[PDB]
Write an enzyme that holds these catalytic residues in place. Structure first.
Site, PDB file in Angstrom:
ATOM      1  N   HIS A  81       3.562  10.885   6.905  1.00  0.00           N
ATOM      2  CA  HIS A  81       2.979  10.582   8.212  1.00  0.00           C
ATOM      3  C   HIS A  81       4.027   9.910   9.098  1.00  0.00           C
ATOM      4  CE1 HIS A  81      -1.286  10.438   6.323  1.00  0.00           C
ATOM      5  NE2 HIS A  81      -0.864  11.662   6.588  1.00  0.00           N
ATOM      6  N   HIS A  97       1.947   9.150   1.438  1.00  0.00           N
ATOM      7  CA  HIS A  97       0.879   8.974   0.461  1.00  0.00           C
ATOM      8  C   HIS A  97       1.170   9.923  -0.692  1.00  0.00           C
ATOM      9  CE1 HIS A  97      -1.600   6.950   3.565  1.00  0.00           C
ATOM     10  NE2 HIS A  97      -0.946   7.767   4.366  1.00  0.00           N
ATOM     11  N   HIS A 126       5.671   6.833   6.765  1.00  0.00           N
ATOM     12  CA  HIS A 126       5.328   6.459   5.404  1.00  0.00           C
ATOM     13  C   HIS A 126       4.764   7.695   4.722  1.00  0.00           C
ATOM     14  CE1 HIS A 126       1.624   6.068   7.721  1.00  0.00           C
ATOM     15  NE2 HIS A 126       1.058   6.526   6.613  1.00  0.00           N
ATOM     16  N   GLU A 135      -3.530  13.549   1.655  1.00  0.00           N
ATOM     17  CA  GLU A 135      -4.762  13.078   2.269  1.00  0.00           C
ATOM     18  C   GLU A 135      -5.498  14.254   2.911  1.00  0.00           C
ATOM     19  OE1 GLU A 135      -3.645   9.516   4.584  1.00  0.00           O
ATOM     20  OE2 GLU A 135      -4.518   8.485   2.839  1.00  0.00           O
ATOM     21  N   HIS A 156       0.832  -1.199   0.000  1.00  0.00           N
ATOM     22  CA  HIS A 156       0.000   0.000   0.000  1.00  0.00           C
ATOM     23  C   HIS A 156       0.870   1.254   0.000  1.00  0.00           C
ATOM     24  CE1 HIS A 156      -3.136  -2.887   1.153  1.00  0.00           C
ATOM     25  NE2 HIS A 156      -2.413  -3.203   2.213  1.00  0.00           N
ATOM     26  N   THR A 216      -5.685   6.531   8.460  1.00  0.00           N
ATOM     27  CA  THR A 216      -6.287   6.740   7.148  1.00  0.00           C
ATOM     28  C   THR A 216      -6.281   5.490   6.292  1.00  0.00           C
ATOM     29  OG1 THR A 216      -4.281   7.502   6.079  1.00  0.00           O
ATOM     30  CG2 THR A 216      -5.671   9.168   7.176  1.00  0.00           C
TER      31      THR A 216
HETATM   32 ZN   LIG Z   1      -0.661   7.586   6.411  1.00  0.00          ZN
END
Ligand SMILES: [Zn+2]
Ligand SMILES: CN(C)c1cccc(C(=O)NN)c1
Length: 259
Positions: free
Chosen positions: A118, A95, A93, A105, A63, A197
């Protein structure tokens, strides 16, 4: 078979079928409306103590990629800000998007950044991460927006290991990484109560989102987009657009540490 992800058939709009809390009262991310967030003079400066951080490994989990830390002692912790007590860094990590105009996000006045970092921390009064994610004040996530411009030197070591973890389930040793190299100049922030999230979407997080984005180069984010969601020997699916969109704020207040 079926598994949550970010595609047409298993993306954010489907998650509630496996994780009903997806429609809960404290879901993340949210849009940060700068004209509704209120300055709170009782908020303290954020205290980031990362000098003794010990990174261990980087993992493609299908992911995103996680850089993991030794959290057996108070080596890299977040205190102050809106928090009571001490929160230990366990992993970070990102996004990101398929294009520079999407990927974050959280949004700011509906603006979407190219990516979002994050840094995940857990409250040491609960003893371990697994117990912390059973508590409403179990986690603190420091969120940092990425915009495309000049390169971020402290990100380059991450970029240059990604070739070795191209596919789901691959990991690589990743020691002596200093997460201070991912911070912007200012530690001014917004804060609100929310959730993970990603599934299981648990509503355990005090979010601390920095106002100032970091700048990364187009080449740095391009390399993120060469990762794969799939495992080795499966059809290639580029790891892009691994972001959940903004969720309803409901009965929550976003506070600002700055005016
Ligand atoms: Zn995250
Ligand atoms: C995986 N544990 C965790 C904890 C807190 C937040 C997140 C997150 O931001 N997921 N995208 C994940």
């Amino acid at each position: 078979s079926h598994h949550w992800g970010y595609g047409k058939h298993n993306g954010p709009e489907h998650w509630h079928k496996d994780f009903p809390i997806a429609k809960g009262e404290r879901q993340s991310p949210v849009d940060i409306d700068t004209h509704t967030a209120k300055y709170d003079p009782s908020l303290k400066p954020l205290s980031v103590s990362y000098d003794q951080a010990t990174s261990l490994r980087i993992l493609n989990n299908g992911h995103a990629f996680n850089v993991e830390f030794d959290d057996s002692q108070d080596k890299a912790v977040l205190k102050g800000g809106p928090l009571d007590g001490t929160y230990r860094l366990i992993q970070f990590h990102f996004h990101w998007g398929s294009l520079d105009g999407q990927g974050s996000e959280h949004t700011v006045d509906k603006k979407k950044y190219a990516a979002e970092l994050h840094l995940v921390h857990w409250n040491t009064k609960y003893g371990d991460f697994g117990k912390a994610v059973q508590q409403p004040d179990g986690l603190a996530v420091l969120g940092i927006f990425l915009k495309v411009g000049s390169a971020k030197p402290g990100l380059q070591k991450v970029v240059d290991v990604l070739d070795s973890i191209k596919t789901k389930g691959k990991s690589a040793d990743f020691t002596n990484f200093d997460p201070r190299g991912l911070l912007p100049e200012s530690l001014d922030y917004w804060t609100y109560p929310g959730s993970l999230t990603t599934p299981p979407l648990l509503e355990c997080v005090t979010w601390i989102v920095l106002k100032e984005p970091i700048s990364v180069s187009s080449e740095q984010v391009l390399k993120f987009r060469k990762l794969n969601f799939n495992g080795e020997g499966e059809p290639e699916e580029l790891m892009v657009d691994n972001w959940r969109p903004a969720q309803p704020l409901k009965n929550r207040q976003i506070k600002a540490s700055f005016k």
